[PDB]
Design goal:
It comes from Homo sapiens (Human). Glycans are attached at residue 42. This is Interferon alpha/beta receptor 2. This protein has 77 residues and is mostly beta strands. The chain has a single domain (1-77), classed as Immunoglobulins (Immunoglobulin-like). Helix content is 0%, strand content 51%. It has strands at residues 6-11, 16-21, 24-29, 34-37, 43-47, 55-62, 71-74. The strands form 2 sheets. A 4-stranded antiparallel beta sheet has the order 4-3-6-7, with no helix packed on it. It is globular. The structure holds chloride ion.
């Protein structure tokens, strides 16, 4: 039994700012695609080189697996 990380995202035109409150994984989903990011571990991690006007979803979780509910946003133009 344990507490999984909480997180917020805010989306910018070509990057997403991921704010985590704490092996730890930040999963970036686009359509068809899933990228797994490994932050160097309250930190902020920035997913960059993204496409404007595109939907992305983010999930944060510890690996040993409960994937967080996804948080999604639409990047501005
Ligand atoms: Cl790069």
């Amino acid at each position: 039994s344990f507490e999984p990380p909480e997180f917020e995202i805010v989306g910018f035109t070509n990057h997403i700012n991921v704010m985590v409150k704490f092996s730890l994984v930040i999963e970036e989903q686009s359509e068809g695609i899933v990228k797994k990011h490994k932050p160097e571990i309250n930190f902020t991690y920035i997913i960059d080189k993204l496409i404007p006007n595109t939907n992305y979803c983010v999930s944060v979780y510890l690996e040993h697996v409960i994937k967080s509910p996804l948080k999604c946003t639409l990047l501005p133009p």
